[PDB]
């Protein structure tokens, strides 16, 4: 909805930003994983 608590805005933003491509240089430092 619209009348959303501010914690929800942080909660929604973090959940969405988890779906983000893992950087190329990240792989170059041995190993980094998903999920």
Partner 1 sequence: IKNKIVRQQQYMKALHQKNKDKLERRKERARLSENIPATIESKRV
With respect to partner 1, which residue has the nearer C-beta, 3 or 35?
A: 35
Q: Please, which of residues 1-35 interact with RNA by CB under 7 A?
A: 1-8, 10-23, 25-26, 28-35
Residues making contact with partner 1 (CB under 8 A)? 21-22, 24, 26-27, 30-34
What is the spatial distance between Cα 32 and Cα 26, in angstroms, rounded to a whole number? 7
Write the DSSP symbol of residue 1.
-
Write the DSSP symbol of residue 29.
S
Q: Which helix (H) or strand (E) holds 30?
A: none
For binding to RNA (CB under 7 A), which residues are involved?
1-8, 10-23, 25-26, 28-35
């Amino acid at each position: 909805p619209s009348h959303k608590s501010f914690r929800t805005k942080q909660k929604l933003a973090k959940a969405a930003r988890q779906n983000r491509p893992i950087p190329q240089w990240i792989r170059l430092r041995t190993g980094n994983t998903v999920h």
